[PDB]
């Protein structure tokens, strides 16, 4: 036969993956179905532009919430492609593609600045961005070695100091590989915004933690104790608005997570050249999901 055998290579775009919006909608459903606020205040506007605060009061039961691993499976008629290329930056064509019935097991965590309990890179650290040139595009950092962070809930979480320092070190190197070897890398704390954005915030065991992460993002070419506090009144992530959750059930609340990634932003401007500044980012949970689904692409079977 003259016919030739060929592997089927598809094009990927982790930035325009419908699996992300789908998961985002699923996470939101699972939450409202298990952790709803006692009072929810959300802005309600009309055409002209006049708005009024909407207040919703409902039962807000609290129960020990344990991580339920989930994954996405292909419905009859479609298949889930998986890019297995090394250092896959998340876009363009993939040479070594495979198929799976469902995605790997995921333990979805809502957080900002740091990605917790996610998947690690097999080779070295990899940084991905929809457009590095654009300083308005978030940079997702996928570590290849997790860093344990334990919160004794006693108002502070602890991390290895040299291990976190080694992490910034390797991350900075990867940034040089993407912006220039002679450029100087510098990490600075958030420039501001809501507390969830300014601090490293995450939900653990159904509680909303806010940790001061200044000691973590102050660097330039033992343990690290971060001051953290639990809040009942916060800003929602599922939608714009404020909410109030019930006080903690258990007496002492602890939390042990693996730092598998980070969300950064680079300071733009043509000012002060030769150096790049990166601060902790995040806020749009879609990027949190995207950090786990970047290697998948659902395509119609044919």
């Amino acid at each position: 036969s003259e016919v030739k055998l060929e592997n089927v290579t598809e094009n990927f775009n982790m930035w325009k993956n419908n699996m992300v919006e789908q998961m985002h909608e699923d996470i939101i459903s699972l939450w409202d179905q298990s952790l709803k606020p006692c009072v929810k205040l959300t802005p309600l506007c009309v055409g002209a532009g006049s708005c009024n605060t909407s207040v919703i009061t409902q039962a807000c039961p609290k129960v020990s919430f344990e991580p339920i691993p989930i994954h996405y499976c292909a419905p009859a008629g479609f298949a889930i492609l998986k890019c297995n290329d090394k250092k896959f930056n998340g876009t363009g064509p993939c040479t070594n593609v495979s198929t799976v019935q469902c995605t790997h097991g995921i333990r979805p965590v809502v957080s900002t600045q740091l990605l917790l309990n996610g998947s690690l890179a097999e080779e070295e650290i990899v940084i991905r961005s929809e457009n590095f040139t654009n300083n308005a595009k978030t940079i997702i950092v996928q570590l290849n070695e997790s860093v344990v962070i334990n919160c004794t809930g006693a108002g502070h979480c602890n991390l290895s100091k040299t291990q976190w320092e080694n992490t910034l070190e390797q991350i900075a190197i990867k940034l040089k590989e993407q912006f220039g070897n002679n450029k100087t890398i510098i990490f600075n704390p958030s420039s501001g915004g809501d507390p969830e954005i300014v601090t490293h915030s995450f939900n653990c065991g159904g509680e909303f933690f806010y940790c001061n992460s200044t000691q973590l993002f102050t660097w330039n070419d033992r343990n690290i104790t971060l001051p953290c506090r639990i809040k009942q009144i916060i800003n929602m992530w599922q939608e714009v608005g404020k909410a109030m959750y019930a006080p903690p059930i258990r007496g002492q609340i602890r939390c042990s997570s693996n730092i598998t990634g980070l969300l950064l932003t680079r300071d733009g401007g043509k000012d002060t050249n030769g150096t790049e500044i990166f601060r902790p980012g995040g806020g749009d949970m879609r990027d949190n999901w995207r950090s786990e689904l970047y290697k998948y692409k659902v395509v119609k079977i044919e």
Partner: antibody, heavy 128, light 110 residues
Framework: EVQLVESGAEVKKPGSSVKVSCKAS????????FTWVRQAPGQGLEWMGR????????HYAPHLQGRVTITADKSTSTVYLELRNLRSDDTAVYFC?????????????????????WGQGTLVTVSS | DIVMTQSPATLSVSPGERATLSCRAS??????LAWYQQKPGQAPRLLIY???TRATGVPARFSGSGSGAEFTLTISSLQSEDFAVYYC???????????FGQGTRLEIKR
């Protein structure tokens, strides 16, 4: 040092409306939630409603049918109870009360439903 | 919705003696139960909260116990200042619909 002072006795005619004030002093206002309790002559206490100051959200007792509104003025650190279309059986002493909720300004809130501090009460007589 | 019933309506006891008041909820209210004391012509004073926690400034002879739908307020040694009306209050439901008991008048037995 945390005290609650209510405005003086009032006499109203049926169909009129009355607004009772409750001045709070002694601590960070936004860190307390306030409740209004009424007591008709010779009867027991009745929970009317409670306002979560920092959030500026008030919850009410059922059978009030929007004839009552509880508001707070952060500026004067004052709580108000507005009762409309007054009936003679609205006659009673209205009590203003509150409790500490924690560092609400820092996002912490206990949402305690009991009443530690109480105002002296305001007699409201509705009669033609 | 949640009815609090106090009993007896009137309790007569000799001074220096011990009195035990009873309050019952039409359904579990957990420990969100408080007790208050009120003298004629005066504002109510908070005695116990959290079903068993005694508020600051409240004499040591006052104590509360119970949980769920059964609570009791104990006054080990009645003093002249303790004869008045006592009310219980639940604040466990949400959306909040807090309710008081109709009270128990404690009078001196002679």
């Amino acid at each position: 040092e945390v005290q609650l002072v209510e405005s003086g006795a009032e006499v109203k005619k049926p169909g009129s409306s009355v607004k009772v004030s409750c001045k709070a002093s002694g601590d960070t206002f936004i860190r307390y939630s306030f409740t209004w309790v009424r007591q008709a002559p010779g009867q027991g206490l009745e929970w009317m409603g409670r306002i979560i100051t920092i959030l500026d959200v008030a919850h009410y007792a059922p059978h009030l049918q929007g004839r009552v509104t509880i508001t707070a003025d952060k500026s004067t650190s004052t709580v108000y109870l507005e009762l409309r279309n007054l009936r003679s059986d609205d006659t009673a002493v209205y009590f203003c009360a509150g409790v500490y909720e924690g560092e609400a300004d820092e996002g912490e809130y206990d949402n305690n439903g009991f009443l530690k501090h109480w105002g002296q009460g305001t007699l409201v007589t509705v009669s033609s | 919705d949640i009815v609090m019933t106090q009993s007896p309506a009137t309790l007569s006891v000799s001074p220096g003696e011990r009195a035990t008041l009873s309050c019952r909820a039409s359904e579990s209210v957990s420990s969100d139960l408080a007790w208050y004391q009120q003298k004629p012509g005066q504002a109510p004073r908070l005695l116990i909260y959290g079903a068993s926690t005694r508020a600051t400034g409240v004499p040591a002879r006052f104590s509360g116990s119970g949980s769920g739908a059964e609570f009791t307020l104990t006054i080990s040694s009645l003093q002249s200042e303790d004869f008045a009306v006592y009310y219980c209050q639940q604040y466990n439901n949400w959306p909040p619909r807090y309710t008081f008991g109709q009270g128990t008048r404690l009078e001196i037995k002679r």
